[PDB]
Symmetry: C3
Subunit: 289 residues, 3 copies
């Protein structure tokens, strides 16, 4: 729709950040669920509450206190969003993706996105890390898209391609790095499907999503990838399989957000060490290279 944000608004917000921190991030990380503790490994960290940054969507999301943190992670200068915005909260896609365009204006070149998702692929287990190789944007099928409305030429083209959204070179490096970590479990990889939420899927819906080729289901990230790729950002992400969805009517139980503990505690730790290692493989700047 007619995005309430004009190009100038993004620039004003980016200019404000540049005048309050000496940090100049090259990488931006959007933390979903488990990775919320990643902020603790950042050195020379400076925090900003989403509430003090003009034009920034303020949020009351149940999970992580809305704050943007600048700092150095494994020799790389980066900025991370500790907590994201979701459509199910009431925000339209142009609000949820506002920070992505600001990152581009700060000079960021790579965006790393993480989330927690239900595993549809039968071969997945709770705690599995799935490298997002592709996605299915269901809201986009009905015209719900962050790029809807008049295109801002200063950010990208009118009809951007999405077939190469997930940087191949990074997925290659992620696999090598996982091997060096000596993990007993293999690093999964697959396509993520986004739904609006906030309720959890029914058995019928999960079987449908699986037939369509989806490996994991979630309620975010996709709009952020579209906007990131639209403005030229290199993109790669990970889903933390927090639960194995039930595909049988003879359900031994039902879904709930207990995932904060499940995976969010055990698999999240590894996920942090993982992203920290990857900072050294991202091309140019940041480190002494």
């Amino acid at each position: 729709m007619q995005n309430g944000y004009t190009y100038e608004d993004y620039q004003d917000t980016a200019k404000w950040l540049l005048s309050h921190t000496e940090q100049r991030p090259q990488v931006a990380v959007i933390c979903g669920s488990g990775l919320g503790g990643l902020v603790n490994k950042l050195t020379q960290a400076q925090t900003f509450d989403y509430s003090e940054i003009p034009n920034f969507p303020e949020s009351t999301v149940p999970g992580h206190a809305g704050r943007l943190v600048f700092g150095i992670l494994n020799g790389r200068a980066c900025v991370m969003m500790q907590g994201r915005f979701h459509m199910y909260e009431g925000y339209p896609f142009w609000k949820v993706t506002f920070p992505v365009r600001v990152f581009r204006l700060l000079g960021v070149e790579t965006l790393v996105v993480t989330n927690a998702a239900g595993g549809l692929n039968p071969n997945f287990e709770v705690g599995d890390i799935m490298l997002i190789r592709d996605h299915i944007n269901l809201p986009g099928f009905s015209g719900e898209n962050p790029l809807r409305g008049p295109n801002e030429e200063r950010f990208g083209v009118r009809f951007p391609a999405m077939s190469d959204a997930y940087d191949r070179d990074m997925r290659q490096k992620a696999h090598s790095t996982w091997k060096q970590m000596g993990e007993q479990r293999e690093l999964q990889e697959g396509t993520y499907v986004m739904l609006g939420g906030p309720n959890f899927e029914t058995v019928a819906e999960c079987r449908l999503l699986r037939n369509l080729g989806a490996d994991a289901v979630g309620m975010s990230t996709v709009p952020e990838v579209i906007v990131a790729r639209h403005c030229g950002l290199r993109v790669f992400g990970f889903s933390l399989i927090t639960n194995k969805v039930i595909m049988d009517t003879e359900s031994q139980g039902k879904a709930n957000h207990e995932e904060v503990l499940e995976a969010g505690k055990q698999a999240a730790q590894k996920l942090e060490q993982f992203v920290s290692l990857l900072m050294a493989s991202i091309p140019v700047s940041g480190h002494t290279g």
Copy 2:
């Protein structure tokens, strides 16, 4: 979206009803198409036009005059909506489901939903009664959901599960009761898929819906089930197969709302006797149990 209705609005409406009728319903029934004559078997019935109840969405739906009726059906005190609201009419999901939350505030514990649907499953025949076992909420895939926006803790949780939406015990009782009625035709059961409407599906669309596992297609009910399950209501419903959809391009005809007569006359009668019998199987209160 930001639901125009605040918690207080639901309470004000519920308080108004309590001060105008001595009736205290334990069960709520939403009548779709055929079951519109169910109001005639209610004893000690009191009628309210949707127009006289504050905050209630007023409607001009082609089918049944908008009125809420309180009364006793087979020893059970209940309230029924003679006519529902539809998205295709212009109403957003928070408007269509407003009555469901009021029912909860009146102390209702069970919601029975009925509708008329096109039979996708090849084994169905016009006049078939299909017990809704599951559903596929297509509008929900794009973020069109009655729960969209900030959650009202007083009604339910942020991420409610939908896998157990259709009460198993009631589906068990419905089957036993159907047997006692001595019906020649079996009681069908399956998954209902909702579409926005108001136009009827194309051959291509029907084959798609069927492949996805849907047994019947309709333009309502799903949002009501989501909200009902969100606030703790026990739920069970029935679809009246008013027509067998054409899956061939060599179409012997096209769809139209003649269904008011077809099934709406013949199968509706049985559907009424059916729901009347079930009132005695619903757990606790109402009757002398």
Copy 3:
């Protein structure tokens, strides 16, 4: 939704056109991409910029200057829209389809729609002309429909059927006419699927769309067909396969709008001659029959 246009607005716009041109079109053509040069074969042509016609949606679409042209094409009086409106531009469906209802009020009886689409069907080649036999309206699954809101009885019914949307007799005539042209390539025919856009599909999304039975993917036309069929217009259309979508992650490239040249130049020429020939096969009026 509550369409901002009242019946009177359509009539006022139709009355304005009737008072500015002596032309009385019997056929209306909506040009998509390649067919944009069709306006050049019209005799006794009169042009109107969308900007000078009251109530008409003004546009800034990248492709063809928004103008409505009246004239005679192969002995048939018709009106063509050189450039259409798209949802991805910000327009809701009631805005995009406004001209379709005006055409009906001018006395038009047949609507011909054309577009450019990605070929999903493996048997298609760039430059292929695909007769649209059916469609899958994805935005319609979520309630995004030009007929959403209170029905205007003066245009059509509340629940119009779509199974016979693409006039069979015309598809029969189109095939005969193609044979007379002596084309080396066969005239394709299939179902078109619409997506919101404006970004191009991912590999995962294309495989999904293909599994659902779609032969070609596009970002328009469907809403126009729904409204046309709702008001009684005979409808038939063509998709110009401007590109073969990549269904493999080992992508030799990515999508982009270079299609203006590809097909838009080579296959468009034939497409024009094609529509010009068909003008003589459309039933009654226009010509001396």
